[PDB]
Amino acid sequence: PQITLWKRPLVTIKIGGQLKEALLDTGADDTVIEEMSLPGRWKPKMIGGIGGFMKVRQYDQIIIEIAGHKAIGTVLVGPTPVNIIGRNLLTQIGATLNF
Amino acid sequence: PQITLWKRPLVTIKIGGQLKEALLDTGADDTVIEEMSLPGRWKPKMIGGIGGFMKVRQYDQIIIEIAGHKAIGTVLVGPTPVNIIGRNLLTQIGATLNF
Numbered sequence A, B: 001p002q003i004t005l006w007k008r009p010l011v012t013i014k015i016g017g018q019l020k021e022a023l024l025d026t027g028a029d030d031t032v033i034e035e036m037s038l039p040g041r042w043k044p045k046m047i048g049g050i051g052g053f054m055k056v057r058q059y060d061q062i063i064i065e066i067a068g069h070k071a072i073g074t075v076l077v078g079p080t081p082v083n084i085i086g087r088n089l090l091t092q093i094g095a096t097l098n099f
């Protein structure tokens, strides 16, 4: 698809068996999802942005379906106000910015 | 161009006669640049990011070149960790997300 940017670029994702809405975010290095359980090991991380930093849990090798396209990678989980699909998974679905 | 996302999508911008680096950020509603002098009056604005809220100065109808494309629109100025080009100006340069 081609997604214009008049509105926030939100898509449906499936993660951990759950359907969620998420923002396709070229400014995010990594994917950050609201608090939820994920299987396996995790380690703490701090991510910084507008407003300062947020503490998250980093889960590796998590499969996400993003608008119907499967991808695997690191997912950070924390009290983000918006689910964000970052570059680490955008690359995997072949996403590009075009102008 | 067609910009892939294996690295940060950084571009050169020109604002107030100065060249700066900025991140093309589809997850940003607004364009936010580090402290600098701009002409005219400004208005208050609060934006919310990953670490919480941030006060900024809102300047309207500012001339800015983004990767060689001319835009004229709102620029928020504040203590952001990186200059970010948000959807308000990405739409002006005709940018879309594609996969």
Ligand SMILES: CC(C)CN(C[C@@H](O)[C@H](Cc1ccccc1)NC(=O)O[C@H]1CO[C@H]2OCC[C@H]21)S(=O)(=O)c1ccc(N)cc1
Pocket: A025, A026, A027, A028, A029, A030, A031, A032, A047, A048, A049, A050, A081, A082, A084, A086, B023, B025, B026, B027, B028, B029, B030, B031, B032, B047, B048, B049, B050, B051, B082, B084, B086
């Ligand atoms: C600021 C960027 C360098 C990094 N951010 C991604 C960015 O797209 C956020 C993504 C975002 C979006 C909504 C809420 C929190 C974070 N947008 C953002 O802060 O935009 C602000 C300016 O326009 C406004 O519109 C959205 C809030 C305002 S971030 O959310 O802090 C972040 C940083 C690191 C990772 N791995 C993941 C996300």
Ligand SMILES: [Cl-]
Pocket: A072, A073, A074, A088, A089
């Ligand atoms: Cl990854």
Ligand SMILES: [Cl-]
Pocket: A094, B004
């Ligand atoms: Cl590629």
Ligand SMILES: [Cl-]
Pocket: B072, B073, B074, B088, B089
């Ligand atoms: Cl604008």
